[PDB]
Design a protein around this ligand. Structure first.
Ligand SMILES: Nc1c(C(=O)NCc2ccc(F)cc2F)c(=O)n(O)c2ncc(CCS(=O)(=O)c3ccccc3)cc12
Ligand SMILES: Nc1c(C(=O)NCc2ccc(F)cc2F)c(=O)n(O)c2ncc(CCS(=O)(=O)c3ccccc3)cc12
Ligand SMILES: [Mg+2]
Ligand SMILES: [Mg+2]
Ligand SMILES: [Mg+2]
Ligand SMILES: [Mg+2]
Ligand SMILES: [Zn+2]
Ligand SMILES: [Zn+2]
Ligand SMILES: [Zn+2]
Ligand SMILES: [Zn+2]
Lengths: 48, 262, 65, 240, 262, 48, 240, 65
DNA sequence: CGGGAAAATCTCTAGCA
DNA sequence: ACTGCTAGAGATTTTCCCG
DNA sequence: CGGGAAAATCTCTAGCA
DNA sequence: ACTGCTAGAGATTTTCCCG
């Protein structure tokens, strides 16, 4: 299980932690508060 | 240093120290101070220092609307070659974007189109034109123009060339098509010392020729490979290595380790 | 068959790895699939994704080859 | 070493330099000189432009006469301004060198002449059969679109990529891509020939042979209208 | 290829080709096509791909006004150490900037102040406070914030720390001073694994101690050096090299090449 | 003598050529139309 | 090897570890253990706060009691809110550990107590002579400024960097920089001692000596209250 | 004198060159002027400008030295 | 000398209006 | 005649710790 | 093999809203 | 389940050209 802290949409505030559903080369698919979001890996930090 | 963990935690809840400050002040090892930082939700404020890599296939195109002199220019780039097609459009609607995209798909083999989440590209009109022409629609992650980093870069270059030929034409559409000419045929450099038009002709001719050559190779070279196991499709028999494909996995094998039957 | 193999090995491939943003040089094409491309760069057989490769036949082949 | 076999197969078969540079692993300048010294043997940029009329609208159609690849636009008026815009778009899209038009008032305009002067297009004064096939496909797909220009672009799509024929069964887009790749190879060979047509080589010291190839360890020259391979240190190349 | 020069020029006046396009199309050598590009005034549109390097002296400070929550924060950084001093000010006038600067010069040895060309810093009031305190005023090149790249970076970091302690305080000035505390003493890392306060104390103590040590060295080590020539001030006699200073030029000399008299 | 083409102040248009008066590490001092300007070397190109 | 000479010069002179670690090129933990084993031998963070009154205005003055470095601000009111703001500014500017105040209503406030709790400042309940000197300099430079707070900051400048004295002739700013650099060295030595006070070394195999230094090829230990240097492979270090 | 020379050589200098943006490591200070700093990095005597140098005495000298 | 492990260093990015 | 930088996040190299 | 010279490659930046 | 890039300007390395 992972914790993802992310930066989402026109907003400098960082949200999280979220559940990492998918980690690809370049972007991640996460789930925060039953909302599935696709975030680039520059705007996301994953902690095991 | 187990008391140092509690004292470093109760000062991280005040000051939000980094790991080196707590490791210096409370004699913690770096893994423990890093775990005190990594458990604070208020301290995860930075992402991974990397970049992704866009799809450089021969069929993918990247489209974007740029603005110049109060007019909208719809630009497309072939990501593999850099070949652009731009047009001054009257409005930034999807009805005018679907015409541009159907026209472009009629000109070149457009297989996939990568846009941002502009209303022009997100509309039902561009969605019907792509279904008719057989184009796959990819959309970038919202408010992340780096996903379209090719076409945005070409946006810059297109405007640059327009700034050199703005006085040779009276209207902006003429200067836009003049800049498309100059980018496609009068600017050389790249992966083969090519212009963008020579590179797109080379890329599409190479894709056709290599697909024909591989379709003629794999119908005659019908072998099977046992390595280490199980049967596998022989892809390439070399002198020091053998490339196979089993369980949908293309894998390279030493020549010592495999043997090819049939 | 062998002439077609040496024909398909005349194409050059410019590829990239997953966390290196710069394009590696003209590798020799060995095999082309719908999603993968087997190349030979620096006497090393590599498997590139199809999305990470630009396969050309450099038409300055009128000098070398 | 394979120059000799290529010369014998050319005096037997009169092969092109494409065949000799591929069946014998020769540089194309050497096989080009083999086919050029033979006395027995001594178009991709041409487009054709017309205006058709359908439903009261005017359609500019350009046909690549070597491949049949069409490019058609519904224009708002049969004016030299719209024709010059179409020609500038086409010249920026494809390597256009010559257009063949029908002495119309919109084709002999000064605006089209300036557009052809800027893009470097010769203007001279197949096409009707292509307009007939394009009108057939427009009549086929008129029910699928609300406006006419959408149907025209749909028919251009179907003609260029969905209709196949000829000898190999290729579409017009594959044919124009192969034809223009062949033209790029032709222009690159002419550039490679013009780069070394100003050199003169003194070898073995016999006379000024002409250079055909300068490789990693050997040069290839032609003296007395016959071709020989000389080592690199046994030759002196003078640009004259 | 002398006719190619004229034809490449008369097509560069139309298309503005780069040098590789003209060198390919007209068989020019690269120096000639580069000279055709370099003579066109319309083609000089790119600057040098480098960056400068700011003054990292122990006396230089970099000042900037940043904005947060509708309030103005005047920030100063010690460029050599990263030590910051910020304050929420009522207005962005020069009367309020000169008070901050005179206060800062009273706290620390401020020798030079590097600002942008904001009216606050460009005023006659800050110019009189700097004349009184003995501070030299440097201004960056206008509309180039990279010249102030230290303090702007610290601006970012300051706001970052305020975002972590905004709920620990009621007013913004308290959170600003809390963030100044956290940056100066609770964030370690850098050139010595230091915090910013430890680094500024080390830098200023090092400057004092090294000035005293060199003033005691050069009054006793009064030698002259003849190398290769002429007399020169001996700066450092090493085993394999000798560092001298003649004609206001500090120069390193091999030990084989010089000899020291007096 | 040198020609300097530069980018000056809130303006993406490039001006020049100007006379190079001083070339330092990081910036240049130039003279265009009897106006002396200090331009960073990222926003200037010098041709001999 | 120089540990022995340092022990003889300490039993002769009772030198500090600063002198022994510099006159003999010793690590400071070794000279600190030499001066700590001697039974004969067995403040930089203190500030002092006050409020003065001048021209109807109130001035918060903080004095570093080890150096005389002052820091004064005209505050709008003698309120614990302004005092807590001053203390938070001072704690963010300098390493403040203890303030000494005079049982005022603005110093024993809950706001100042929370500000001292956040910054980690002990609050306990020189300064008047410093206020007298600061008032003398304010009266000297009152003619140079329009407002009083400008004159107060000018006097803080003149006191900290233009008035010299003491034994070496240094200003108060140089003195506080040297004092706080000495405190940083003291805290770094205490961190270095606490990092190796949990180790036990078994050498030559004799008993659990305590580690003083672990170098590139040798360790330095103390067994039976005397110090010896042992090679690296002839010692085993166990964290206990 | 020689003890003062070895004293001034205990200070570390972090410097930069004119077109390299990264800070080079702890060189040994040899001489300090008002505008130039003579150092010894990588057994090479270098002359740095005063504006391109940060001279400290790293107070983790309580271990090494 | 040889593997793990941990520390050190290198690479790279956002945000600073 | 003036000038991008800073701190964190991973990745890779380098040093240490005992056999 | 050895110097110059020229070509090739590496590094790095603005602007793309 | 998706993703920075592109072309030019200097700097540095690498290959060529004859002795
Ligand atoms: N633009 C300003 C930035 C800024 O852009 N930061 C983002 C940024 C981007 C890149 C980078 F590397 C660092 C970086 F911070 C800034 O940080 N500050 O503090 C400013 N302070 C004042 C003025 C207006 C000057 S003026 O209009 O008063 C004038 C100019 C010339 C002459 C006269 C008057 C502008 C700015
Ligand atoms: N910002 C846009 C840029 C841009 O910033 N370029 C500068 C830039 C910076 C960095 C970089 F790497 C490249 C780069 F080009 C852009 O180029 N384009 O073409 C845009 N097209 C359209 C929209 C609005 C999307 S939406 O509001 O309609 C929406 C979003 C999500 C869901 C629904 C609707 C914004 C942009
Ligand atoms: Mg867009
Ligand atoms: Mg865009
Ligand atoms: Mg500013
Ligand atoms: Mg700023
Ligand atoms: Zn935290
Ligand atoms: Zn023939
Ligand atoms: Zn030009
Ligand atoms: Zn004692």
């Amino acid at each position: 299980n992972f914790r993802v802290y992310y930066r989402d949409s026109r907003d400098p505030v960082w949200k999280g932690p979220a559940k990492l559903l998918w980690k690809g080369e370049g972007a991640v698919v996460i789930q925060d508060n039953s909302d599935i979001k696709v975030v680039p890996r520059r705007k996301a930090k994953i902690i095991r | 240093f187990l008391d140092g963990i509690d004292k470093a935690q109760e000062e991280h809840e005040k000051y939000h120290s980094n790991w080196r400050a707590m490791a210096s002040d409370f004699n913690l090892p770096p893994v423990v101070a890093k775990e005190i930082v990594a458990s604070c939700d208020k301290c995860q404020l930075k992402g991974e220092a990397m970049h992704g890599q866009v799809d450089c296939s021969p069929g993918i195109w990247q489209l974007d609307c740029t603005h110049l002199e109060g007019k909208v220019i719809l630009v497309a780039v072939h990501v593999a070659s850099g070949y652009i097609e731009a047009e001054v459009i009257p409005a930034e609607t999807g009805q005018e974007t679907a015409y541009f995209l159907l026209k472009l798909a009629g000109r070149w083999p457009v297989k996939t189109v990568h846009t941002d989440n502009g209303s022009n590209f997100t509309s039902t009109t561009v969605k019907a034109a792509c279904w008719w022409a057989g184009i796959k629609q990819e959309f970038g992650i919202p408010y992340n123009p780096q996903s379209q980093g090719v076409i945005e870069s070409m946006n810059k270059e297109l405007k640059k060339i327009i700034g050199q030929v703005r006085d040779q034409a009276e209207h902006l559409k003429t200067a836009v098509q003049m800049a498309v000419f100059i980018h496609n045929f009068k600017r050389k450099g790249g992966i083969g010392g090519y212009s963008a038009g020579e590179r797109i002709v080379d890329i599409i001719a190479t894709d056709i020729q290599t697909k024909e050559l591989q379709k003629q190779i794999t119908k005659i070279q019908n072998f099977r490979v046992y390595y280490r196991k199980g049967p596998a499709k022989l892809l390439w028999k070399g002198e020091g290595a053998v490339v196979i494909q089993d369980n949908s996995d293309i894998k390279v094998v030493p020549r010592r380790k495999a043997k090819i039957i049939r | 068959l062998q002439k077609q193999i040496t024909k398909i090995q005349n194409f050059r491939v410019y590829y990239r790895d997953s966390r290196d943003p710069v394009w590696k040089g003209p590798a020799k094409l060995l095999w082309k699939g719908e999603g993968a491309v087997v190349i030979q760069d620096n006497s090393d057989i590599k498997v590139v994704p199809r999305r990470k490769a630009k396969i050309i036949r450099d038409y300055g082949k009128q000098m070398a080859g």
